[PDB]
Amino acid sequence: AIATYNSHVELAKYLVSKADSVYLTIGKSTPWSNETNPPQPDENATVLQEVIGYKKATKVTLVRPSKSPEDDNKNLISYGNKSWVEVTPENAKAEGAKWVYLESSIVGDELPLGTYRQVGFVMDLVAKSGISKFNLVPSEVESTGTLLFFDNKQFQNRSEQTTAKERFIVEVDPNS
Amino acid sequence: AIATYNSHVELAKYLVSKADSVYLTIGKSTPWSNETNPPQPDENATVLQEVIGYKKATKVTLVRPSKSPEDDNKNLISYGNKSWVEVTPENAKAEGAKWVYLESSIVGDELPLGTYRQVGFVMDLVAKSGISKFNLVPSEVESTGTLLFFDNKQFQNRSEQTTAKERFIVEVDPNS
Amino acid sequence: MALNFTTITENNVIRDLTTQVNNIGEELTKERNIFDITDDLVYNFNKSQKIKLTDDKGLTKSYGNITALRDIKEPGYYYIGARTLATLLDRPDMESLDVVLHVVPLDTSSKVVQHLYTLSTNNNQIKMLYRFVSGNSSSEWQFIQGLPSNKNAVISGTNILDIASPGVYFVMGMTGGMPSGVSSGFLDLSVDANDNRLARLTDAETGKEYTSIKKPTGTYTAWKKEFEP
Amino acid sequence: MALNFTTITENNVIRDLTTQVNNIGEELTKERNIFDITDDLVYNFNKSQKIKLTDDKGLTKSYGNITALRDIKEPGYYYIGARTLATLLDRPDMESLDVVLHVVPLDTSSKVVQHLYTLSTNNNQIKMLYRFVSGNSSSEWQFIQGLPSNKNAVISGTNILDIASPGVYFVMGMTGGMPSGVSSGFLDLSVDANDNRLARLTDAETGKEYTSIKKPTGTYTAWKKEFEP
């Protein structure tokens, strides 16, 4: 029997409640067989290939597509060719906010420089005893938590100047 | 973007952790327009129609469909013409168990007698007036919590002798 | 409440059986019958304090074998005599006295806040102490300073340098350790976790102060007098 | 819980008598019947907190006839209205300020620890106090100070000498008693049972100490300053 739309809202509130444990992760520092077209992803994965590291999320929030005029004085986001609005946890079921927005940014060399091709987000990440810094290479992680979401992208390079933003909009069931 | 199989597994471990707050509900004691052919269930709904009562979930567990030979010696359950096996929270990713089994039996007249058509399961249900008992009529529910899963069946009847065992097997994303 | 019933033998006709069934039916269906009174009791007992803070008379509860005060993790009051207290591995550092332990409940059973009240009719012994406990760990016992009869405490008949507790006192009839030419005064004392000390004593007559210090592994110095013309 | 029973008459056939006996036996044997619920209630009640620490609303217990606060030895929270009553002799040493009494249980009903906190109207005056009581006897009251809002209290609109309580305050707008030109300061006051006193005032404007002492005269001395060029 079917899950409901408000079940997907509550499950999104559950994910967004986990926010403090949420990290961006990046990997696949060597080429794909084809760099013009990354392979479509596999949901049975538990980690990225060739992991470069983890960065604590700067933005975990509920979202939905915006609607004018009533949303014109809410927090708008432009992503993936479309307009969206954030939603706060205590307003999720009043708004229908079953999507989650995830973002982080890597400021310069706070992970070792190079290229990356995979992007993912984990919840329940924990670092080794007494580490507090928000950037972690894999060997500084104690528990990788759970890999929730990820993608295969064309490469991006990183240098000291560049603040590498990476982001997703997602829903717990994208096909219903 | 997309969720992953193991995300659904961990979300099922979350709904199973809620189990004590879980109740069967039955309703729709008057006819549909066609009694052989009910209307399809609307996931925007928040409560059943014509509510007859609530009964605490006599069972909540992770399960999966059974597979041979490796389940031939295990804890089998029979449901809806299919054979299922119980799974435990700390093994859910090793077995691939993303399905939740939910069940409650209304013995005889422990809810008011007469026909019912709707069957649902609610979590976070809270009763009135310090009440201990696991069978509740609507006048003894304070907060209905959240209607997680439901179906619009044909009618059935209940008498003093007949137990009405109602149950589901469900996953957090049945279909992406 | 009470049923009226007479046992029915094989020799009794159907009328007799009918009379007894009517008796049972009427007692079990009258106003305020056994069912109603029991439904009243359930609705009441659900609202009570369901486990003991005190015994059934109001007194301290019983406890099984403890090595340490941290071992008692139930909410309630417990009496602990001086002979017991002296043996407890996590006791406060003081003269051994009778005490009550009151235990305060938390989010969890493995953790508790503990209050200890010393039971002495001597104002110089009576003190309050508390701490937080988690698993086998805790904070130290926190000593809490107070004024007997709203006054600074009075100490006498002793060498002053043996006084060790931080605080403010009146000190009089002191046998030894005083500044030369002083006979009573307000004593202000501070002492740390390293056994550094500061004693500031003022002579009750002149209002001259004197200071002494003690280093971790020493006695006090002599009393350094205030600056004079 | 409830039996459905109909009284059986001469006209009723053995089937109807059988229906009533079935109705009785079913109600009395149904799963979690009257018996099971009552055995659960007893087992609950033997565990229970069989004595009140609060009234039936959760409010303070009232009490019997008294002459002293040590007369209340039943455990609980107790509270007092009228000045007409509040006259009793074993109260702590400060003015009429009204109170709640908590009574802590010990080993024996003849002995208790008593805890005191203040009431009726207004803001600042309150203290916390405690003592130990045994038969009729006790310790004296032990008074605890507390920093309002994590800060030293501010006292204003009074003569600095009329304050009798020991402890640290900030003083300003004092109607009298101060040293020349000194408008404000921290006051550290010390007082004993004989009524010796040591007042230290520090001028908050400059850091100059002014000390004065009170002996059984009733008068504080002149302001002995610190030393200067």
From TrEMBL, chains A, B:
The organism's place on the tree of life at top rank: Viruses
One Pfam family from the record: BW3TFN
Official protein name in the record: Baseplate protein
Organism name: Staphylococcus phage 812
From TrEMBL, chains C, D:
Lineage: Viruses, Duplodnaviria, Heunggongvirae, Uroviricota, Caudoviricetes
Protein name from the UniProt record: Receptor binding protein
Superkingdom classification of source: Viruses
Keywords: Receptor
Origin species: Staphylococcus phage 812
